[PDB]
């Protein structure tokens, strides 16, 4: 079966729609997510036109093998989609209405700069390659673009599912390709990060600062070194949920900066002890008293600077 | 093959049933579970009706390809089900009795608020899309809804498997859809959490409170900081078994609150030491003696408040 | 093709056999194991009977599509088995001899009460569903039940592979089902647990008891708290290899009990220090000397009680 | 299609060959590895014999469906192999030359006794089941047995790929089976284990022995207990890369033995402190000075004994 | 269908091209990566040649089954590729233009010597096996070799995608094989390793060196032993992201060397304490003051040596 013939030198328009049924398995590290949706297609093929009286049916149901179906693919998928044809209906002017339900693992990069207060635009690219007989162009039927109410993605808020109505028509290997961009807008549910990572991380840091109210070097060393190890544990935990990025993330910046605070706290505790041993506790007392104010103040200001640069 | 014609403008009723054979792989983080079941379907096709006297046979067995079968799908599945037709039997009046055995990975969100003392309602949504010739409606045959006795789900008690008998009939892409809700009620076996997480967590916390019976700052620092690290280990272990939720869980709330108890214990140990060094051990003794009562009392009351808010 | 007709109102007996070739991937947490085996089937089809003299051949080989084959399934499988027909041979009296090689992931619950000194009976349930024409019953051909010598399951000893010869004949969805139980008896190789978990766990516990030969509170606190943290590590390691059970396991009981020993050791170390500070070291010495005997004695007796209750 | 008829009562010889193209995914814990190879088969079918003069062609190419092909399988595979026929060529005398490219996951147990200085023989068992018409025997064509130069297995040295030329001919379910053993000899690249596990483990152990040059009980307790915890971490790391074995491994033996050294070091540190407190430091000094020599000497000799028993 | 006949004894040239659409899942440990691409093939079949005037059409479109297509495979793939034919076009002179879209998991070893400042050349080997009728040789059509702009690989910079135009023609099992090498050049984004592993590792090491400004043995032991444990954590973290190599990596070398620095620091802290106890603090002070300079100087020089040897 060959493609439908043109009335004039016009290309064949294949109207498309995607209705999301199930959205799942957003793998942040992998930049992959799985989708289960309806894919609707519509085009005009005058070779299948019919007169109802002779046929006895107002619309005909064809099997995919019986008629010409455009070879529609997704660009940003791991493998060819898992598709099951639901319905093929032909009107007697030859307007075909195709519907399939598919599942596919989609590849769409994520921007982690504001993690875990980040938002993303997941893309689903629909494509058709033109044939030698005719050029095929994709169009959006907005009445067939949407998502189920129950659609959920663990740890995310689903904002919108829309299509950029104008296709990207270009040449690939001396043939026209017509590409459509379907956009799924999402925003991370940051809530959990507060009681699970941010506050525990702040608690251990503030615990290290109690060394500024102690002259016991041995206790101070135990305080700063133990809390540092706990900070290392949180750093490792965070980087297991994140991919390696060629940029700094918001959380990554805070985590990194906190190491500097632990490093200077160890210097303070060392300087304090050295002075005490040298019989200079008055100078050591001045440094410890200043540290009581300096450490929280510099921590607060540096965080304001970070929040400002990132948001 | 076209759908059965109506006697009047009535829709086609397809009676359904699901009998669970094997239930497994409940992935809490993923909100997915796997199912292996019988799917029974029943409808009337007058074109298939026959006289038992003339034909000789009481029932006719058909191959799926030979007759019209409604296109039944699951809404909340990752991929199309793995199905194998078991039997197709037709009665003399044209009543078709269809039976298949299928396996599918179902997507059903879980409420973790009362974790690990939580109960869940897993859903299995059956759906049919209406055709241009006729409208198709789903119904429940209660005699064909059930589960095997041996059905088990590791770490859960299976309470019931029932169906909401009235379908959700709605329009999707200008066609009637008839959706049925099959509910699998389960309740978590909390037992194991007690000796494995709750009691070990309480033991380390109570170990930190021994610092209220010690004047040794160095030992106190070792006691509170070491037990805090062990609490961090348990917090990390718990959050690896749970997804990120936009709400607080019961366990999450207790775990978070325990950090505050460790934080105040560090303050007490610091205040005590500072006073001793300042030659004020009488004031320090009053604070330590009060802490011996205050810490368990505030811990007990705060837990009563939490249990009340969550249950 | 319809089922063979009865001589009288007798049911059709399908003789079965399972010969294990490869056994692998026993997932303790999941209650799943993978199997690769021969499935042999035998029944009489009089319609297929022939005269050896007239036909010339002693046996006739058929393709599955050419003759009636019973629809045999496994009850406790994740998905329908991966099967490949090896041979179909028909004898002159119409006795069909069917052989296939299959692979399946089997679901069989495990009893962890005596872990890691536990034994299990893995089940493989064969089933046939009766048809409207006739009732089908399963039987065991003991000469076709066995396993390869090389069959191994990492961390287990394979004891036996036998079949319960009498089927469980019952009604499921108003049709007779004939179910056969194939049993694979296994016993865990506990060896490794001794040098890897049990002895290291005992060593750290005995290390904590050295605090009963020390008056240094700071060293005692370091001894008991550090070894407790190591015990927490072993507890976490153990529970990662085990599912969450609504009962206590043998290892779980020992692990839990050891927490109580650490808890009382912390009390002893605290009481000892408090008394020393109060200028009562003679009373403290009596408690420490008693602890030297009490702790190993109570540990030994409590273990005898546990071993008795569990074995 | 039936098997080739015999000239006399001789069995049909199917010459075989396996040429490894890609070898990957050796899972030590699972005893599985994946293979991608050419499988060559050759046999004589007199019914396919032709005159080169009359036919014109020197060789005839057939599609698998057109001629009789022996049913060849692998014994120790998880599932049936993924195969794609490359070529079927028939010579004038009726000698068929079959070639396919396949991929399979092979199950072959490993001996971990000398880990990580162990060598293994991975097996690939080829098999044919005899038919009622004729008996089929397997043979090795050594010119069709080999491996690609680029063949690599991460962390291993590939030594050889050979076949045991004489098959194991036996009866399974009253039919002859002809089994061939293909052996892939490999030897572990131990290099990495030295800087990553062995030397770090020795460093922490030697760090614990510095307690023999200290009278500070508190520092000694910190030294031996901290290094023991680090040894526990290495023990856990090692057992995650290894399956549970019913025998001792070389590394397992060294790791276990090192626990005894830590245990005796804790006894020494305890005895030393007890004596000092009892005003017996002269006796304590004799024990500590002896320990300085005894610990490295006993460690060196015990290792010589272990290396001797294992190699 | 047989291969095209030669005009003379010349081999059949099959022009090839690969256009990368999606590149993903680079598993460093496994030496595997997944690819989604267009595979273009072109050859001349004179038997398919036609007159444009007589036939009417300028090009003829065929279904794969209808004409002779060369059997093209990939050498270094796990399984046979997942392919879907897009277009087959025949020009009047018989020049066939074939296009398919495929996905495959490719096996390509990586050189970790300069990790994480390493670059790699991923290989995709295209191959054709000659037939008995004719010899088949592969060629590169450079106009059909490329990659999509959007192509990305998390944690990597994609440099180029080119082909070695001259094939590796060799004999395998007495038949010509023509192999083409497609090279995907990538370079690791080392950025993240700096704040996540390198700087935290340097911070803990520098924290251990504060013991050179302290006479407190107990605090020194806590400082060096605690930071060593944190270094062990980072060593374990690094080796989980890397495979076991028979060579030293850059990071591996630095990590290993840092153990020696911790070992000598423990010796210094021990020697210092021993001397103090022996009433020789003047000699101990000389060693500690020298260590303050020696440790950073030797660390800096050893790193210059390492960087020089590795880059
Ligand atoms: C006045 C003292 C300030 C010390 C500042 C230390 C800066 C370290 C820079 C690291 C750059 C990366 C190498 C680690 C040395 C730690 C410093 C020890 C301080 C001793 C105090 C003695 C009191 C006189
Ligand atoms: C030390 C701890 C540092 C925590 C910094 C607070 C988070 C923040 O400031 O994050 C900023 C986010 C971003 O939300 P947005 O809508 O994407 O902002 C986009 C705004 N533009 C378009 C103008 C740039 O605000 C929140 O989620 C606020 C609630 C989180 C508070 C958590 C406190 C603990
Ligand atoms: C009377 C002293 C009360 C101290 C209360 C501390 C409140 C901290 C609030 C954190 C909020 C988030 C920053 C950490 C500082 C720790 C407090 C050290 C106390 C020293 C006591 C000295 C006795 C005179
Ligand atoms: C500090 C440790 C805090 C532990 C809190 C106890 C658990 C609790 O109070 O949880 C409450 C659960 C919930 O059972 P439910 O039937 O779902 O309650 C629903 C009741 N409504 C419908 C009225 C809201 O009760 C149990 O499982 C009781 C046994 C667990 C005891 C474990 C003790 C350790
Ligand atoms: C004779 C003293 C016995 C102490 C027994 C402690 C029982 C704790 C029960 C917990 C039940 C769950 C809360 C933790 C407090 C630890 C006890 C501190 C003891 C101090 C000794 C002082 C010596 C005069
Ligand atoms: C503290 C450490 C406690 C260790 C308890 C020993 C194990 C035990 O006692 O386990 C008991 C097992 C069970 O063997 P069974 O045949 O199933 O007993 C069934 C007997 N009936 C039918 C009478 C009930 O015996 C063994 O495997 C013995 C060897 C293991 C010794 C390991 C010592 C370390
Ligand atoms: C002379 C003293 C030798 C000590 C030998 C210890 C044997 C332990 C055997 C364990 C077998 C399993 C239970 C742990 C006790 C640790 C021993 C404390 C030693 C105290 C020394 C006091 C100096 C007089
Ligand atoms: C404490 C640390 C103990 C380390 C023991 C060394 C390893 C060993 O002795 O292992 C022995 C291996 C085995 O090599 P093989 O050819 O299989 O021996 C077979 C010989 N027969 C046939 C005689 C039995 O030799 C090596 O790989 C030697 C190099 C490794 C040195 C690593 C040192 C660190
Ligand atoms: C001057 C003393 C130098 C010590 C050098 C130590 C070399 C260790 C070589 C390890 C090779 C692998 C076995 C560990 C012993 C640690 C050394 C204790 C030093 C005691 C110092 C006493 C001061 C007089
Ligand atoms: C102690 C910490 C050691 C850190 C060593 C620095 C890295 C290095 O020196 O790595 C070298 C890399 C390699 O880049 P290249 O182009 O492949 O060099 C090839 C050059 N030839 C052809 C001459 C061999 O340079 C970089 O990425 C430089 C930036 C990284 C700085 C990170 C600092 C922290
Ligand atoms: Cl697609
Ligand atoms: Cl479905
Ligand atoms: Cl089955
Ligand atoms: Cl196979
Ligand atoms: Cl391929
Ligand atoms: Cl050659
Ligand atoms: Cl050739
Ligand atoms: Na078509
Ligand atoms: Na049908
Ligand atoms: Na059949
Ligand atoms: Na300590
Ligand atoms: Na065949
Ligand atoms: Na072809």
Numbering used by the authors:
A (entry chain B), B (entry chain C), C (entry chain D), D (entry chain E), E (entry chain A): 5 to 315
Task: Give the exact sentences the study uses for this entry.
At present, the best structurally characterized pLGIC is the G. violaceus ligand-gated ion channel (GLIC), of prokaryotic origin. Each subunit consists of an extracellular domain (ECD), predominantly in a β-sandwich fold, and a transmembrane domain (TMD) composed of four helices, labeled M1–M4. However, the GLIC is a pH-gated channel, activated by lowering the pH, with a maximal activation at pH 4 and a pH50 around 5. We instead found that proton activation is a complex multiple loci mechanism, with the key contribution stemming from the coupling interface between the extracellular and transmembrane domain, with E35 acting as a key proton-sensing residue.
Finally, mutation of E35 produced the strongest effect; therefore, a more extensive study of this position was performed. The mutations E35Q, E35A, and E35M (the GlyR-position equivalent) display a significant increase in pH50, whereas E35K shows a weaker nonsignificant effect, and E35H appears to show the inverse phenotype with a marked decrease in pH50. Altogether, these data show that the loss of charge at the E35 position is important to the gain-of-function effect found. Mutants of E35 are unique in strongly increasing the proton sensitivity. Neutralization of the E35 side chain by mutation to A, Q, or M produce a similar increase in proton sensitivity, whereas the mutation of E35K exhibits the same behavior with half the increase. Interestingly, the structures of the Wt GLIC, E35Q, and E35A at pH 4 show that the side chain of residue 35 is located in a hydrophobic environment bordered by the side chains of P113, L114, F116, F156, T158, and P247. There are no significant differences, measured as 5-fold over Wt, seen in the backbone Cα residues of any of the resolved structures, with the exception of E35A and E82Q. Interestingly, E35A also produces the greatest structural deviations around Y28 along with neighboring residues. Altogether, the data support that E35 is a bona fide proton sensor, whose charged form stabilizes the resting conformation, whereupon protonation favors the active state. The functional proton gating of E35Q and E35A mutants additionally suggests that if E35 is a bona fide proton sensor, it can’t be the only one in the GLIC.
